[PDB]
Ligand binder design. Structure first.
Ligand SMILES: Nc1ncnc2c1ncn2[C@@H]1O[C@H](CSCC[C@H](N)C(=O)O)[C@@H](O)[C@H]1O
Ligand SMILES: Nc1ncnc2c1ncn2[C@@H]1O[C@H](CSCC[C@H](N)C(=O)O)[C@@H](O)[C@H]1O
Lengths: 249, 249
């Protein structure tokens, strides 16, 4: 019943946070099992080389199929119709964007393997050949350029594992994007701090007005920061009139 | 001349990867200085409490202004006109998206402080009050929900620090999104592996044809995975005709 994550990387230590904070707690609840594997275990030469110059010339290095292929073959055997193949996630800025829908889908997986790139990335034939053994997804965490895939593993792992029942715990298991909108601001005690008062509606005890305030603040934050998300929705008169009030200042 | 990063968190150990791989090398080149601070140092009660129930009712916990405010005040003094204030980055899924343009801008900063949220996040008054001391940016790394802000610090740090001269090193300092397109696939030796041959143009030595192939493959990957990015560009006849050939199959 535990999700198994296997990560193949030249920097195993980068994945130490998979055993910290909430994911570490998930392991102690038998909800998560983590294996981190040094890609160099599969390098044959004495130099433990994992990369080589790109075909076509040009700078940089590309990771070697003769190392990656055996590594992926071996890790797949660690606890065929497509649905029965394990999932292989390959972080790359040229992959389809990671979405909350992906996180929900992947929370159902029994076994996720991650292939972590560095340098120019992994020879593309590794990804194609891996389809014989895995369901393969290339995935970008956003429109920006990282140094390696390891940090993207940590991102995806957080978003996926927190959707496994029991991981968040009784207090946080109850978010942004859920209804197409960003979440608004939150407040706690004291009522007044450094001259700033919590919105008075929140101390009114009136559940209907508090709930409307929360909706307004979500519309307002979305309008401020991601107004194009509102263009994709049909707002009712209450919400549309509120947003028009923002546009008029 | 070194960029200083200070991170405030209830899980300092999560930031251990700031001293691994390339960022660890950057520290050893005097290009980066990292401080990680336990938020609980600023908790007053014997219980070292950093969070409390939200105003308005409802589940979850919100991090306390009476802990965050002093923490941010103290860390700002660690090596006023707006431009002279340090930059405070506050990861939140309700923040403006992190972009490569942000990464370029922030690579010029002398001092970046990160406030890492957990639970429902940080009382919003902390963010507003912090504007007296910092230039403040709320930033989302993507449209998905994480457990804490620590992993988003690792993401932003990779994307920013790799733009500091000297960090990538002579071999990788020369990417996706640079021209609005995703990068295409890369290949290395051997020419044939598991029945898959590297594209023959790449072994032709013809630089003009190789360069055109690289452009086509970038257009193709973008069309496959992010076709809306092509809608935002005026492609010339060579590129538009190529993409139309993809649409016709
Ligand atoms: N936005 C992103 N999402 C997921 N992984 C990323 C990423 N940015 C970089 N990476 C990881 O970091 C590695 C090196 S960056 C590869 C850079 C390439 N020249 C390009 O710009 O397309 C990638 O192979 C991938 O594993
Ligand atoms: N996409 C994202 N980008 C940056 N930080 C994120 C993030 N998702 C979660 N976080 C971090 O994780 C913390 C807890 S998640 C807060 C969840 C909130 N109820 C909501 O859905 O809006 C946030 O406060 C932030 O620090």
């Amino acid at each position: 019943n535990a999700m198994r994550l296997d990560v193949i990387t030249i920097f195993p230590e980068y994945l130490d946070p998979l055993r910290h904070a909430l994911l570490g707690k998930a392991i102690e609840k038998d909800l998560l099992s983590v294996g981190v594997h040094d890609l160099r275990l599969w390098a044959e030469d004495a130099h433990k080389s994992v990369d080589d110059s790109p075909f076509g010339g040009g700078p940089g290095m590309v990771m070697k199929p003769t190392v990656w292929g055996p590594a992926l073959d071996d890790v797949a055997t660690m606890s065929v119709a497509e649905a029965d193949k394990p999932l292989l996630l390959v972080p790359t800025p040229a992959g389809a964007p990671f979405t909350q829908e992906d996180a929900r889908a992947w929370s159902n997986e029994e076994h996720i393997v991650f292939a972590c790139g560095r340098y120019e990335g992994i020879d593309q034939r590794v990804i194609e050949d891996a389809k014989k053994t895995y369901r393969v997804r290339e995935v970008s965490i956003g429109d920006y350029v990282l140094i390696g895939g390891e940090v993207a593993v940590l991102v995806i792992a957080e978003a996926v594992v927190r959707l496994i029942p029991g991981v968040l715990g009784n207090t946080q298991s109850h978010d942004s994007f859920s209804d197409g909108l960003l979440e608004g601001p939150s407040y706690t005690k004291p009522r007044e701090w450094r001259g700033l008062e919590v919105p008075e509606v929140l101390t009114s005890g009136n559940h209907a007005k508090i709930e409307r305030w929360r909706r307004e603040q979500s519309l307002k934050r979305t309008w401020e920061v991601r107004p194009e998300l509102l263009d994709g929705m049909e707002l009712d008169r209450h919400d549309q009139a509120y947003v028009e009030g923002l546009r008029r200042g």
